[PDB]
Every structure is written in structure tokens, then in C-alpha cells.
Ligand binder design. Structure first.
Ligand SMILES: Nc1ncnc2c1ncn2[C@@H]1O[C@H](CSCC[C@H](N)C(=O)O)[C@@H](O)[C@H]1O
Lengths: 127, 189, 72, 202, 58, 144, 121, 125, 32
RNA sequence: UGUCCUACGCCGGCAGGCGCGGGUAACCCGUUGAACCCCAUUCGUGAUGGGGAUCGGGGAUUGCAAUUAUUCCCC
């Protein structure tokens, strides 16, 4: 059809720019920490048509998608589907997306450095 | 009546070049339903001149690696290209292909010769069989290099190349290659 | 340079396609895509949309190539 | 097999070939690398902005290298399309659409150095009937010898297809007044077989 | 078989240069130490710089 | 005189049979019908969210054509080509759980029954139901 | 400090059989296959070395070749020097060293730490 | 009265049984407008489109096909069908009719009654 | 034809003839 | 080719576990239901749904032993 009057070309989701001129199942994939498969399941759990474009979602569907994103386990998303299943410091099934992934990688490498294992010393000798 | 693809008549097809009449085989003995025959057409010299020319084009679309052996893909491409040609110009695509081959064949080429350090070009004439061969090869190369990275299907670019080569316009890749080959051969008499 | 084909129809583009597409003597998603600056999915969907109104004649359909023509 | 065997250099390097040339990542890397060795092999006055002549500039790849080093230059090319895309790359040095074999049109003793990257192997093949390989090479070398400030070296990177090619080039250079030799950097190495005819004019 | 090909290709290069030389005198006026025995290639040395080949022109 | 399944276009047969099984509504759809890839060589989930109906229809058709097949035969049948990274591709079977669940759901429909010589096969209810829907498809296609 | 939401004290109280439920899959497989005589011997040796240690500073050095030893929660605070093929390297046993083998903390290899002709005539 | 012939390509072998009938033509229990590749569909109907449906109006043929690939199976199907028709009009119908049939089958496509003697080459040590 | 192809063809023809010719509890008690 | 090849049933989403059978073999895997290919859907010239490397976490399997990732699965 034609353009609606409320088409948003760029979305601001989890401090990430989302190109609205894309399919929703791949515009969500454009967020770090979300791939194609996880975006597909989070949009199917929200009961949202995948033929429908991302840039003209209303605010309610965007907020419901986000609430499923930071809360997967509350919406029957399986335990084995997540990024960090058994976190080493506090074991809980979680899904870090925007800044949590970069941070948690940083203290992962920092924990590897601080114990002077082979992997941390090798990776920080690599640069 | 035998018609290609259940639609395409071969009775009104005529060849306007007397050189290529015995080497373009589209007539009542060579009229076939499909460009797929799987015949032993290269086991003896000059045998491939009796091949239907649509089958020669189909065999020459199976190029560049990934497309080797995919003949059903190429007969699909040929069928869609023939439909696009008919729905564009309103005239039978067999005559369009025959005219494109006739206007696409180089009539005069060059040969690299040398004795020691002195490498030159000698102008020679081109046999009708090699005329047909380079015409088919340049048409396939023109279509393939034409699309390759755009929204245009291989069938649409192939149809456009046969249409513009039958017209003899300079926009075709095959016509430009024939023109530069004949220009070099004319400058190397 | 970089193509900037549109993803949903603007008003002027929709009007000019609805008054220009059913007479091209060649209707195919690629050609309407390249002459209307439309991404191929939107051009495709517009083509079965125009077929739904009976303004467009299908002559063959394939998974790789579907081709149309004018009515008369 | 070889770009040179295709035919006339201008007809070979058309708009299509020019587009593919700048799109080729290897072209960019190998040409800048060869121009680096070229500027090093020719012993240009150290810490001195030089005035070189690009005998085969093409896309201005070797030319852009000289611009970065601060050495002003003048380009020469038979391909119009390649010179168009070279000026689209906005190179600092001037350009000139001319033939090497015909002759370089500059005052005897003007250029302190000359950069030629993959362009002299095209002069050993007569693409036309009037074209004479020996004469074309000799005339070019004689013009270069004069144009080059007597003493300055003219590095000439070439890609020989046989010994006859190299033989012709060397004889037509030594008899034109060009002295020096040829530095084949990494001779055993095949991917690094780089033949540079170092030719000083004095 | 390709080894003999390459080797005497280089030999024909050398012979054609050595036969260029006498008419060059009349009408007018290479990696040997860098060869590796164990392998085909080009090995660096410490006393001499990176591999090269100088064939002077007369 | 009755038109047989083998006399009907197979893809339209599968589409109409999936529509019929969705219309009946007696299929036991598992909870994880949304969150599963159909085999390890897949990359994304199927876009057709009613994939269980189509897979059950295809399974019923296959057991009509060649009975005595078990779970492993179904994993062989819907197996495909796994692209192994920068390694050469290979052949990988389908997921066993999806085959077992479609077989048990079709068995719970009384559509499919076990046999003494092996796995599953058709019921006479299954045979005459497929014949009836094949007659419907042949009427909708051949008579038009 | 906490490990999988579990602190060190009840980690020391935590039983051997369900200690595997917080460890990783390789870890759980190894503990299912059981520690052999050498590992139990070094366990006894570490416990003995922690026994007569004076209660203000760390115990003495225990040297071993057991690179496939896993750090167990009871070892936290031991002074272990493990072999790398040539020499022994001494390491602390920190609480966050729990999931890693001993052989990771003595690297067996050293890192790799690796003029143009111009013609004058 | 009935006959049984075979046709073949590289490794695809088809066996055709020919009996009196009304014009029902079957391969593996399926019609010839149902055998999997439609792109080579006219390769299946070539004896039908040349010889006419009136000459097929009084015959039933059933073909069992095994081996090869899709294209080779189609070629075996058409070879077996043409050989079955030739055999029927040789054994139980007059000789001259078989003569014009066998003729027109030859000058259209010579492989319709003789197998192609091409197969994959072996590799030696 | 050759051995393997003819063997497959013979088996196909035999099976086809059998399935054209084609178109209970075993007798545990011997007496009628 | 096979006394490690495997049919079948159950559990798990997947690697994979449990049980019960056949095969020392044109008998069982196996009417070797292979991949390209064919049909239909989505994608639209964009280093992008092309391309997959290198990395973080978790599960499983073979072994006395997997750490410098044996291998496999998922994100
Ligand atoms: N006779 C001749 N006169 C002028 N230019 C010539 C020539 N023969 C060949 N050339 C030039 O040789 C070039 C080959 S490519 C040279 C460009 C160089 N490799 C770089 O990118 O830095 C072409 O651009 C062509 O124009």
C-alpha cells in the first residue's frame, strides 16, 4: 500500500538506531545481542505479523516487544534459547542486548586477566 | 504441427544471410518441442551445425562455474526470454534470434603472428560456423555481463540483448564487440 | 551511486503508477522497480494488487519470473 | 591470459575495464607497492621535492603515491577513460592524453626522474600494420632520455611475456643513450618477480 | 617436468641476453646466492640485503 | 472409476489436506510449535506458522505412498544439506522429536495406526479420508 | 565474592554429589568419571599443607605435575606450584579460579617475538 | 494379447507392459502429466503429440521405472513407451502401420527406439 | 546390454509381471 | 562396508540417553526415500536476509586424561 502518516524512519531502541525501512524481524536483529532467530521468536511471542514493516509500528507494540526482550523467561521463551545461561557470578538465565553484552564481555576478559590464566594472558598479549 | 514450447511456429522463420543458412538449423526437420535433446553432437566435426540453434543457445547459457550442467534452469531462462521478446516486439522470437545471430557474427577477424619479438595482427576471414559460434558466445556473454548485480533478471537482459542485436543497435555488447573486432581487422589488412 | 528505492508508496508515485503502469507493453517487478525507484517487494505486491483489480493480464508465473501485459 | 595480448591498449582499457580496474583491490595494493619500490630504486635526491614524469599513470595510483611523498608529476596515457577516472580521483599532478611511442613533448632536461608502472610491455606488440615495435620503443626511449634531466634515473617496471620482449626493450634503451641495468627484486619469487629497468640519463 | 620447463626457460633468457650482447657491441658501444636448496623460494640473508638481481646494461 | 491420490497434483493435495486438518481442529499441537527449528541444518524458523498441519499432511501422504515407515524414515525423508561453515556441505537428517510428535498426533486422530512389521501405517479411515479429499481436489482442479 | 549465586562458606559446606550441578558440562563429566588416585593424593597433600600452617599467613608451597587437576572449592588459599615441562610456577588459589584447570596457570610455551638494494651505477 | 519391453538411459531403466485398453497411460501408477519435472514435460508427450491420440485410443500401457536421475528416468519412460507401441503394432496389428510409425519415430528422434550407449567412465591406477 | 543393467531390467520385468498377475490365518487345525 | 552397521519404541528442541530386535551379509540397515535439480514463499543491489572467520556463555559424547579450545549442538 502507501505510506502511513506515522511512519518512523529511525527508531531509538536500547540506545540503538533502527532503520525503519526494513522488515521487523531483521530490524530487531539490527540490535546487538539479537540475531535473526531470537528476533523471530520474540516477534512471534508478541503476536505480531512478520510480513509487516518495522517503521510504522505503534508505540504499544514496540513497548511490548521490548518488555519481552528484557524479560524472555516470563513469556515462555525457553531456557536453552538465551545468551548467558549460567552466569558465573550470579547464576540466572539472562539475555543482555545493548550495553550489557559489551560490559559483560569486558569483565569476562578482566576475570580472565586477573587470575592469570592462559586465555586472558594470551588474548591481552594479542594486542 | 511441431511447435517449440507448444506455441512457437517455425514455418515463417527465414534466414536473410546465404552464408549462415546451412549453419542455423531452424526448419521443419530441426523443429523441436524443447531445446533439450541430449544428443551426441560433438563426437564428430561439423556435427553441431545440425543442432537446433535454440539448443545451442541453451547449452551456451550453462557458463561460469555454478551454472554448469543446470540445463533445466537455462531452458526456463530461454522460455521466459522468448515470452518477453514476443510481448515486447509482437513478432516471433525465433526470427529475432536468427537476426541477432546474423548481425552478431564477426565477418573479419585478426590473427596474432610473430617470429622473434615482432608480434603483429594479420586479417583473416571468419568461417560461417565460427560466425555462428562467436555470435552465440557474444550474446550469452552480453546477457551475463549485463545483469549480474541488479534487479534485472537474466531473462530480461537476455531478451533485451537479442532484441537490440536483431536491430543492430550499438547498445548491445555483442554488436560493440563485433564492431571493434572488425575495426581491428580492417586496420590490420 | 547508491540506490535509494522507496519501501512504501508516496502519494505522487502511487498516482503516477496507477495511471501509467497498465500501459507499458512490459510489466515485470524488475522494470517497474527500476523506472519507479521502488524496492522489489513493494513493486511485486503492487503488481498482484493491480492484478486483483483486473487491470493487469498475467501471461506466465514462476518462482523466479512472473510476467504481465496490458489488457487491450 | 595477458591483458597485453588482448589488442590495442586504448580499445582494451575502455570505460568497463577502467571501472573494474579501480574496483580491483589487488590492483590498488600491488601498484602502490610497486610505485614505492620504484621511487626507492631510482635514487632521487633525499629530502627534496622531486619532479617526476608518470609515463603510464592510468588511474593515477602511482601518481597519488608521488603526491603523498610531495613529488609533483605529469601523467601520460593512451586510454581516455582511465584518464577521466584519474581526474575523478582528483590527483594533484597534471595529466596529458598522449602516446609514449609517439614521443614525450617536454623540454630536454625538465623532469628529475620518471615513474613507469606496467606500461612499456605494450610497446613491443604491433597492434596496427603501420606500428613497428622496434621503432616505437626506440623513439619513446630517445625522447625520454632527452626530456629527463641528463643524469636523473627513469625506473621502468615491466611485465615481460618472454625474453624477446625484454631483449627488444633493453637494446632500444641502451642505443637511445639510456645507461644502467635492471633490478629484478626477488628473482626466484614468482608472485614477487618485479623487473625494474633502472635507466639513468647520465 | 615443470621444473625442467622453468629452469631452461631461465637458461633461454640468459642465452638470449648473451647473444644480444655482441651485436649490441657491434652496432652500438641473478639470485644465485639467494636460491634455497631445501625448497623453491627466496630466503633472506644477514650479510646481504633482501633478495634482488642486478644485470647491468652495456 | 474413483480418482486416487496418485492421480492428483501432490502439492495442492498437501495444501488442501493441511487446510482440512486445520479445519478439523482435533490435532494435538505441541507447546513448542513456535520455538523449534525442524532440523539441525536449518537456519531460521518456518515462516508459515501453521507448519505442524502441513508437516502432518505430508506425513500422512508419505505413509499412504509407502507405509511401514518409522521415526527414522521420517528424519531421512525431510533431511537436507547442511552447510558446514567453510567446510564441504553434507547430508543431515531431520529432527526426531518433530517426526515422533506428528506421528503420535496423526495416531491420536485415529488416522494412523501401528503395525506388527515396524512403525506406522494408515488406517482404513485414513485411506478413505485421503481418497475423499483427493476427490475434492480433483473436482476443484480437473473439472475447472 | 559469589559463584553462581553461591558464597564460599556454603560452597565448602556443599556436597560432592550435587556440586556438579553448578559446574560446567566438561566439569560435570569429569566429576562423574571420578578423581583417580593421584588427584586424591594431592587433595590429601594440600589438606595436610593447610593443616600445620600458622594461622596468620599463607601455607607452604606444594609442587605437582597434575596439570589436569581441577580447582575444587576446598583448595581456595593453597600455594600450588605446577609444572610446565621445564620449571614450576607457583600460583595462589583464588575463589574465582574455581572453573579452570591447574595447567592453565603455567603456560608451557613462550610467546613468539620475531635494507633495500639501490644501484649506484 | 500383451507385450512387455524395456527402455534405458545411463542407469535409469524402465519396463513397459502394453495391453488392450482405452487410452490410460501410466508410469509408477501416475499419469504422464504428473511425472515430477514439468520442464521436460514435452519429452514425455512426444510419441503422443507426433502419433496422435487416435493411435493411443485403444491401448493401455503401464511402466515401472527405477534407477538413474530425473532426466534419465524421463528418457527411459519415452523410450519404453515408443518401443511398447512398436512391439504391439508388430505382433498383433499389421506390418505396414508399424513401418510408418517406426519410420517417423526415427526421423524425429533416433533415440526413441535405440538406447544411448553413453555411461560414466571408470578411473584406473 | 551388460550384466548389471540387464539384471535390474529382468528384476523389474519379473516384479511387473507378478503385480499384474496379482490383480488369513494359517491352518492350525489340519482337519476340515 | 559392517560384530560394529543399524531397524523400531520411549524422553529431549538439538547434540544425544534408555530398552528391545536383525545382520559373519545380494536375507538386516536398504524399494540405500542423497545432494544439486523441480515447485511455491520471503528478501531487492544495500560489505545487506550474501559471506562466514575470530570470539562470550551453556549442554552432550569418546576416552585413564580434552587445559593451548578432540568432536558435536544452541544462543
Ligand atoms: N603507447 C602508450 N601511450 C600511452 N599510454 C599507454 C601506452 N600503452 C599503454 N599505455 C597505458 O598503460 C596503462 C596500463 S595500466 C597503468 C596504470 C598503473 N598500473 C597505475 O595504476 O599506476 C594504461 O592506462 C594505458 O593508457
Amino acid at each position: 500500500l502507501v505510506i502511513p502518516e506515522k511512519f518512523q524512519h529511525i527508531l531509538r531502541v536500547l540506545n540503538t538506531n533502527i532503520d525503519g525501512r526494513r522488515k521487523i524481524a531483521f530490524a530487531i536483529t539490527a540490535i546487538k545481542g539479537v540475531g535473526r532467530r531470537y528476533a523471530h521468536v520474540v516477534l512471534r511471542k508478541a503476536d505480531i505479523d512478520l510480513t509487516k514493516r518495522a517503521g510504522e509500528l505503534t508505540e504499544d507494540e514496540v513497548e511490548r516487544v521490548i518488555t519481552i526482550m528484557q524479560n524472555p523467561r516470563q513469556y515462555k521463551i525457553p531456557d536453552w534459547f538465551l545468551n548467558r545461561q549460567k552466569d558465573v557470578k550470579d547464576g540466572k538465565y539472562s539475555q543482555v542486548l545493548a550495553n550489557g553484552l559489551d560490559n559483560k564481555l569486558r569483565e569476562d576478559l578482566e576475570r580472565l586477566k586477573k587470575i592469570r590464566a592462559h586465555r586472558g594472558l594470551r588474548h591481552f598479549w594479542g594486542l | 504441427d511441431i511447435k517449440l514450447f507448444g506455441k512457437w511456429s517455425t514455418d515463417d522463420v527465414q534466414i536473410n544471410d546465404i552464408s549462415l543458412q546451412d549453419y542455423i538449423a531452424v526448419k521443419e526437420k530441426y523443429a523441436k518441442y524443447l531445446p533439450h535433446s541430449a544428443g551426441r553432437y560433438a563426437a564428430k566435426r561439423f556435427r553441431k551445425a545440425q543442432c537446433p540453434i535454440v539448443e545451442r543457445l541453451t547449452n551456451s547459457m550453462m557458463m561460469h562455474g555454478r551454472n554448469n550442467g543446470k540445463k533445466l534452469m537455462t531452458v526456463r531462462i530461454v522460455k521466459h526470454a522468448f515470452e518477453i521478446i514476443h510481448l515486447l516486439t509482437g513478432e516471433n522470437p525465433l526470427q529475432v534470434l536468427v537476426n541477432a545471430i546474423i548481425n552478431s557474427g564477426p565477418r573479419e577477424d585478426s590473427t596474432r603472428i610473430g617470429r622473434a619479438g615482432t608480434v603483429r595482427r594479420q586479417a583473416v576471414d571468419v568461417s560461417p560456423l565460427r560466425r555462428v559460434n562467436q555470435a552465440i558466445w557474444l550474446l550469452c556473454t552480453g546477457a551475463r555481463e549485463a545483469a549480474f548485480r541488479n534487479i534485472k533478471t537474466i531473462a530480461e537482459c537476455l531478451a533485451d540483448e537479442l532484441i537490440n542485436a536483431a536491430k543492430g543497435s550499438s547498445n548491445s555488447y555483442a554488436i560493440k564487440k563485433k564492431d571493434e573486432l572488425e575495426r581491428v581487422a580492417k586496420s590490420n589488412r | 551511486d547508491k540506490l535509494n528505492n522507496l519501501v512504501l508508496f508516496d502519494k505522487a508515485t502511487y498516482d503516477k503508477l496507477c495511471k501509467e503502469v497498465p500501459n507499458y507493453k512490459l510489466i515485470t517487478p524488475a522494470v517497474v522497480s527500476e523506472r519507479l525507484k521502488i524496492r522489489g517487494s513493494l513493486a511485486r505486491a503492487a503488481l498482484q494488487e493491480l492484478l486483483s483489480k483486473g487491470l493487469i493480464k498475467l501471461v506466465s508465473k514462476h518462482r523466479a519470473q512472473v510476467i504481465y501485459t496490458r489488457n487491450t | 591470459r595477458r591483458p597485453e595480448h588482448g589488442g590495442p591498449p586504448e580499445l582494451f582499457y575502455d570505460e568497463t575495464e577502467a571501472r573494474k580496474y579501480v574496483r580491483n583491490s589487488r590492483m590498488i595494493d600491488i601498484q602502490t607497492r610497486m610505485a614505492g619500490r620504484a621511487l626507492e630504486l631510482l635514487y632521487l635526491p633525499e629530502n627534496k621535492p622531486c619532479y617526476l614524469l608518470d609515463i603510464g599513470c592510468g588511474t593515477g595510483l602511482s601518481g597519488s603515491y608521488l603526491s603523498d611523498e610531495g613529488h609533483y608529476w605529469v601523467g601520460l596515457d593512451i586510454s581516455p577513460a582511465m584518464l577521466d577516472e584519474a581526474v575523478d580521483r582528483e590527483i594533484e599532478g597534471d595529466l596529458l592524453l598522449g602516446d609514449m611511442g609517439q614521443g614525450i613533448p617536454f623540454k630536454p632536461g625538465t623532469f628529475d626522474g620518471c615513474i613507469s608502472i606496467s606500461a612499456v610491455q605494450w610497446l613491443c606488440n604491433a597492434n596496427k600494420k603501420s606500428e613497428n615495435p622496434a621503432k616505437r620503443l626506440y623513439c619513446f626511449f630517445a625522447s625520454l632520455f632527452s626530456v629527463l634531466v641528463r643524469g636523473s634515473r627513469a625506473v621502468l617496471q615491466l611485465y615481460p611475456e618472454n625474453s624477446e620482449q625484454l631483449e627488444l626493450i633493453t637494446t632500444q634503451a641502451t642505443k637511445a643513450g639510456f645507461s644502467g641495468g635492471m633490478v629484478v627484486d626477488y628473482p626466484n619469487s614468482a608472485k614477487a618477480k618485479k623487473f625494474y629497468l633502472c635507466l639513468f640519463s647520465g | 617436468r615443470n621444473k625442467k620447463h622453468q629452469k631452461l626457460k631461465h637458461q633461454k633468457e640468459a642465452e638470449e641476453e648473451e647473444l644480444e650482447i655482441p651485436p649490441q657491441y657491434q652496432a652500438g658501444g641473478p639470485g644465485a646466492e639467494y636460491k634455497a636448496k631445501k625448497a623453491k623460494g627466496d630466503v633472506k640473508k644477514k650479510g646481504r640485503p633482501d633478495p634482488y638481481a642486478y644485470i647491468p646494461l652495456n | 472409476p474413483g480418482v486416487t491420490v496418485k492421480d492428483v497434483n501432490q502439492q495442492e493435495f498437501v495444501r488442501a489436506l493441511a487446510a482440512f486438518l486445520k479445519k478439523s481442529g482435533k490435532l494435538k499441537v505441541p507447546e513448542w510449535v513456535d520455538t523449534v527449528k525442524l532440523a539441525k541444518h536449518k537456519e531460521l524458523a518456518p515462516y508459515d506458522e501453521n507448519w505442524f498441519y502441513t508437516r502432518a499432511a505430508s506425513t500422512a501422504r508419505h505413509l499412504y505412498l509407502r507405509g511401514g515407515a518409522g521415526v527414522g524414515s521420517m528424519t531421512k525423508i525431510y533431511g537436507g544439506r547442511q552447510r558446514n561453515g567453510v567446510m564441504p556441505s553434507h547430508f543431515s537428517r531431520g529432527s526426531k522429536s518433530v517426526a515422533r510428535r506428528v506421528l503420535q498426533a496423526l495416531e491420536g486422530l485415529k488416522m494412523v495406526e501401528k503395525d506388527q512389521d515396524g512403525g506406522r501405517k494408515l488406517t482404513p479411515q485414513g485411506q478413505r479420508d485421503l481418497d475423499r479429499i483427493a476427490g475434492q481436489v480433483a473436482a476443484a482442479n480437473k473439472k475447472h | 565474592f559469589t559463584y553462581r549465586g553461591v558464597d564460599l562458606d556454603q560452597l565448602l559446606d556443599m556436597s560432592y554429589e550435587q556440586l556438579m550441578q553448578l559446574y560446567s558440562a566438561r566439569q560435570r563429566r569429569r566429576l562423574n568419571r571420578g578423581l583417580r588416585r593421584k588427584q586424591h593424593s594431592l587433595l590429601k597433600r594440600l589438606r595436610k599443607a593447610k593443616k600445620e600452617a600458622p594461622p596468620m599467613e599463607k601455607p607452604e608451597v606444594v609442587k605437582t605435575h597434575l596439570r589436569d587437576m581441577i580447582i575444587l572449592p576446598e583448595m581456595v588459599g593453597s600455594m600450588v606450584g605446577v609444572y610446565n615441562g621445564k620449571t614450576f610456577n607457583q600460583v595462589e588459589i583464588k575463589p574465582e579460579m574455581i572453573g579452570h584447570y591447574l595447567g592453565e596457570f603455567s603456560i608451557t610455551y613462550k610467546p613468539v617475538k620475531h635494507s633495500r638494494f639501490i644501484p649506484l651505477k | 494379447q500383451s507385450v512387455q519391453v524395456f527402455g534405458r538411459k545411463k542407469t535409469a531403466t524402465a519396463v513397459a507392459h502394453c495391453k488392450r485398453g482405452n487410452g490410460l497411460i501410466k508410469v509408477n501408477g501416475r499419469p504422464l502429466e504428473m511425472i515430477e519435472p514439468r520442464t521436460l514435460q514435452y519429452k514425455l508427450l512426444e510419441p503422443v503429440l507426433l502419433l496422435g491420440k487416435e493411435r493411443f485410443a485403444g491401448v493401455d500401457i503401464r511402466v515401472r521405472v527405477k534407477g538413474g536421475g530425473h532426466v534419465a528416468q524421463i528418457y527411459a519412460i519415452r523410450q519404453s513407451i515408443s518401443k511398447a507401441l512398436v512391439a504391439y503394432y508388430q505382433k498383433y496389428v499389421d506390418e505396414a502401420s508399424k513401418k510408418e510409425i517406426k519410420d517417423i519415430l526415427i526421423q524425429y528422434d533416433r533415440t526413441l527406439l535405440v538406447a544411448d550407449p553413453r555411461r560414466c567412465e571408470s578411473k584406473k591406477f | 546390454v551388460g550384466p548389471r543393467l540387464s539384471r535390474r531390467i529382468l528384476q523389474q520385468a519379473r516384479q511387473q509381471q507378478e503385480e499384474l498377475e496379482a490383480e488369513r490365518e494359517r491352518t492350525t487345525r489340519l482337519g476340515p
